[PDB]
Symmetry: D2
Subunit: 419 residues, 4 copies
């Protein structure tokens, strides 16, 4: 089934086909003069996938308010239908990230809907940073690191349930992000809290299938405003190293202190084999969870530069998980996810254009200016024609958001769904 | 009316009177050696008041979750009852700050309950950063600076209603904090948005009584994550100067960029006569809204140092409004407000101990070390005995939280009020 | 000609074919977008930014300085080097002087400038360091020092800078001082600012009718607790207090972490106090790195506000543009060349913004399309436009490549003695 | 004695009565709290922190250095001044040397230290600046430089520092380098770190059985884009990789804005890699201001983690303590005196925390009482304990007052020639 009528996709592609041909051929000639085969780049770009978050499909909110738009998804099934639109038009988001209990539903039904829509499932996400109705023990003062044994046990069991749901739908990983921490000096004993966390995570690790990975996600602050148990990549590395080979670190771009060199953290984790994956988004102040690349596109490119360099250095067994983790408070969630996925492919494509041999030479000779200009020559390249052609060749739309709007999809679901 | 049994207050005071007498006399002797009359300090401290936020007595939350405790107040009336406890025990929070529509209710009843509890009302707070039921125009894309004229008009009318409510209960000011801004480059035209804001505030200004003040509150970010119309004190100054004499700037401690020298902003606003008031709280990362002085007590003292210096060089008319703006997510709201008000008086008392003449000399002589040590000599002084004696002498508790717990108030209201339920913070819609 | 014309010609010819292909391709793409590439190029070739005399020599940090070869022996050598930057980029016809670093006979400075085809931008005073023979030290301040005689001395220095500027063609004085405190209590914030305002008022009295006085704010460094002119708010208060000739200068790296700098630019323009800019890039503090080398989009967003001002018809808006950078690990000339290029790049992209479309998206609160409208311009590779602008004005298609081909650095290395003490 | 004993005696007697009153009052208050003031004073008397040789001279920024009178020139003058700090505070018996700044015949250094009653803490290498005659420049790095010969030179320098330390009684080497990049792409993050680790392994091989090797992380400066040893995470990787003798040194001002530094301390302790501390205070960057002059509570919270670690009986816990500050606008000796005092103040307050009560409030999630339990200790004015500790051990009740009364500064000013009168 197609959420967007194929005739609309075809019409909107034909409408822009002439211009795309001109732009693609021009870029192809330019890249040829630079010793690059545009076809090789396009081939790789159409193979780059990033998971879409179920929680990014509906309108998000801040601690002050939430302003829903029309046709808001009523539950996970509406969310999957909307995710199908993003994948159909961008062809870059074949998999969806589920969050439990937000997306709790019959696993078999979720799988059935996914297969029918042509969607798979990425890492499962547990939730012990909020209480559900009728919950025995509250996570107000923590979960996996709570001082109360029964509360930690409940948190561990919840994570095990997430694994069971994931096994039924085809997921192969569990991502653990908790709000555990303190808001006041002295409230928590830093070391004892971390010890409790490690012990609880060891229980989750024990119940982790051998064909699964366990990702821990660090965050400097929020909801905890003084200290956070898994506060940065250093603590995260200690966690992954302690737990075992199936445990790795997940880097969410907006979870770092002001001015942090995030691409270096990425490089360090790769060198020590603990880069499990990414949570892409952009930010300017805190964990803003904005559309990827909308604020600092160069930083996104620099992160991908490290990923491509890893392949160039010959790093083996490196297949980091890629996922978008964003909240859309003032835009149509589907449109934001579409352009965010596009931006991630944009940064990747540009990273593929870097002349690695030239860069290596400038690095060895300490020619800082030419080294940085070598990266800029790739980053400054407008790869939109490659992204558009990749989409066109794989069943997507030349201009995804334009096609989405032309389809009238939002108005359609607005009529099918309550206000 | 006394929310806390007088016999309990008396009992818990007597239990700690002996120790307090010893500490107070010891501190008195120490201050005497330093040429300071402890009685003069205590007299000033017992007269220092800070407004308590009605939204502070209810458990707060983040965008991820809210974890209510027992005996959560149902509405403004329950909140007033709880605020009465803070005032009774600390004697430092006689006035309450209301937020509309959260606390909307019959002005006559609000005023009636306040008088019965011995509580007054500080500045009113308007709310155009969220949508209420039946609202004609959404504030999703802004309010006072929204591109849509009808939306700005609705926001203006709401603020005027806040003034009308305040006039009936004894309030003398309106604080305006909005979330207006953008999450993406290009979404808003910075200049046009600010022009719209200024025009809307001018309409609100026209509705201000002669003895009223209009306080605009700046904030770097949140809910807007790229730009905010009233983003810092610079824009705030432009607003206040543009609007008129009754318009001033409100400084919320947790609303500034990392590493900002906040006490300097305070001094600058005082110098140009635009320091409307404060929203006290503490923080480490963003607008954390934590208990005042719980993270950076020296910074709080340094802010008070600027205020007391002004109070010293006689900046007449200068009467900034002091208010606590905090959210309590992991403590009993009443206890946190009690200790926060205490910490504010602590910083004030220490600022009063500064040898101004000595400091001035070291400043003129560029003796940086002795100048800083002159501030430290005041700040290092443990003024707790003064704070406790001030409370005891005015009908309060030597140890407020201790007396609060001994009274069993929380368990009391917990049995009178309906049970609460924990949930999310609205990060996503129902599912 | 600092750089042999035959070298510039040879290197331009070597790259002519590719430039033609790229420029024509971009022109067709822009035409499809309703933009005339020729109109953009014509404006870009007229965008100028002042080159700092202090940026031509290798810079350093408080830990160390690592000079390269052929370091300039003073202002005359510095002007010669600035001439290279202008000849190759054609985007830096004016030089920013700093006194007393560049103190010399005004007549000689003017003669060298004219001979090289260079003019002079705003003068920069220096009361953040002590020069020989000073009766008073600036250790504890200058224009805001507690000692009246010290303030008077700093005022006289600034007036001297104005005299030098008048003689060479300058029309403005930029004042940046380190005045502040390193400890709470050391300074009375208000009295220190009042002293500063009194001293600046005196300097203001010495301004010719057609001169401007620019005050430059900075959050910290050299002062590590408080700084008198710490941010744009205090800066606005200064400009408004002094008069119409006084405006604020915004140095990109002088703001608190995460500050929305482009908004500050918009605010100052709205109130007629945006005197000018000090361009550079940074990641941590006032790093003074090559413009756009760290955050190119931010640079574009600043230019977006500048171009919007013109779009809104702001009257009498002629902000000064200057590069303020230090080059610690690169050939200073090469870094200034590429920095000037990046500045023109961001400017060119700002010119490409479809503001008619943007205005509509802003009115309808279509945040996604509004931001995509800016991105469509920013994502455009305008290098062909910058290169063609250089070709037509006597510059080099690839400035740094031509610079290296000329062997200039090796040449001056043999002519200039390296300091030995 | 640098300071005449009669002066120390006179200035102590002048303040003896007030100290007695305050000490007895605090003793009674602590008694009511179940604490023996005598036990606290005994512990405070034994808490030592190393004084930096580079701290007694006036510091500066990249903009300027404003020396005071009697500036110590050379390590011998510096040791004489360090002796004053130890005599008056009795809290700084050991000095931290920096090579080559303090290079001198080891026998003479040792002899001078012994004569002044001073020992030597960890040695500090310098490959972040170039020395005269140096074969390879550190402009682009040292231990992680791309050039093998440059890395070898850096390694040899560090080995030389170990040799000097062995001769004077030092038992550790602290390695802080500026290695990094100012531009994206300039360095390959991974390869640079691999080179650093290989170089450090060579240095590790030259460590005596009873020596420690401390690596010091820093977010930025001198490198403004990336730094090889940028944070505690990389630092942990270094220490774990090198071996049991390698640990991490935490300099308070070397972290990103808002970082929870006390947590980093706890984490390193838990994994046995907390080598030591570089105490100072800051507000913006690596300001290197007097300890506790900006954020005294943070300093106390760091000490709370140290005292807790000992209370828990953690193994491998025995950190070195050193002051790493620069004094740009004060008498260096006075600042070091009061900074050492502030460090002992924070330590003393940490000793007052009721650990049993705190543990209970933590287990029961009583956040308010847990934080108040820390505040009860922090709010306690321990000055009487610090003063009594000094008085009982040969120091001064009020160190700075005694220092000024002695006229020491004027004395060395008369013995040491300044650049200009
Ligand atoms: O801040 C929360 C983290 O980004 C987590 O990944 C979280 O589970 C996700 O954002 C959903 O709220
Ligand atoms: O961030 C919001 C500001 O602090 C306002 O004062 C607000 O109205 C208050 O915090 C209640 O949410
Ligand atoms: O930080 C100093 C400012 O950028 C000034 O413009 C200064 O005069 C210039 O950088 C030269 O040092
Ligand atoms: O920033 C430099 C580090 O703090 C090092 O410890 C350094 O060796 C010391 O500060 C002396 O410069
Ligand atoms: Mn995430
Ligand atoms: Mn997040
Ligand atoms: Mn507030
Ligand atoms: Mn707030
Ligand atoms: Mn500048
Ligand atoms: Mn600067
Ligand atoms: Mn250090
Ligand atoms: Mn340092």
């Amino acid at each position: 089934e197609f959420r967007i009528a194929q005739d609309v996709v075809a019409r909107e592609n034909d409408r822009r086909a002439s211009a795309l041909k001109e732009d693609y051929e021009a870029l192809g000639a330019n890249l040829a003069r630079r010793g690059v085969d545009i076809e090789a780049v396009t081939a790789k770009v159409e193979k780059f996938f990033v998971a879409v978050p179920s929680w990014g499909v509906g309108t998000g909110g801040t601690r002050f308010a939430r302003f829903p738009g029309t046709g808001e998804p009523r539950g996970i099934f509406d969310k999957l239908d909307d995710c199908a639109v993003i994948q159909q038009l961008t062809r870059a988001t074949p998999n969806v990230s589920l969050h439990i209990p937000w997306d709790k539903a019959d696993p078999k039904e979720l799988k059935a809907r996914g297969d029918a829509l042509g969607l798979g499932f990425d890492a499962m996400n547990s939730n012990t940073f909020s209480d559900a109705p009728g919950q025995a023990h509250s996570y107000k003062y923590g979960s996996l690191s709570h001082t109360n044994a029964a509360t930690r046990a409940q948190a561990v069991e919840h994570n095990l349930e997430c694994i069971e749901i994931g096994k039924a739908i085809g997921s192969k990983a569990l991502t653990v992000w908790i709000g555990d921490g303190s808001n006041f000096p002295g409230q928590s004993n830093f070391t004892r809290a971390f010890e409790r966390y490690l012990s609880a995570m060891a229980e989750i690790y024990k119940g982790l299938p051998d064909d699964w990975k366990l990702f821990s996600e660090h965050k400097m602050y929020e909801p905890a405003f003084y200290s956070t148990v898994v506060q940065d990549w250093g603590t995260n590395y200690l966690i992954a190293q302690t737990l075992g080979p199936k445990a790795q670190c997940l880097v969410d771009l907006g979870h770092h202190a002001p001015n942090t060199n995030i691409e270096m953290i990425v490089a360090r984790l790769i060198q020590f084999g603990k880069l499990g994956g990414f949570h892409f988004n952009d930010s300017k102040y805190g964990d803003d969870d904005l559309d990827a690349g909308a604020i600092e596109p160069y930083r996104l490119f620099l992160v991908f530069n490290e990923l491509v360099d890893a392949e160039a250095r010959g790093v083996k067994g490196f297949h980091p998980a890629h996922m978008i983790d964003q909240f859309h408070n003032v835009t149509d969630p589907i449109e934001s996810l579409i352009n965010s996925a596009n931006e991630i492919r944009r940064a990747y494509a540009q990273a593929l254009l870097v002349d690695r041999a030239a860069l290596s030479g400038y690095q060895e000779d300490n020619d800082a200016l030419m080294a940085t200009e070598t990266l800029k020559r790739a980053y400054r390249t407008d790869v939109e024609p490659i992204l558009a052609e990749a989409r066109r060749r794989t069943g997507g739309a030349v201009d995804p958001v334009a096609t989405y709007r032309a389809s009238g999809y939002r108005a359609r679901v607005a009529a099918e769904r309550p206000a």
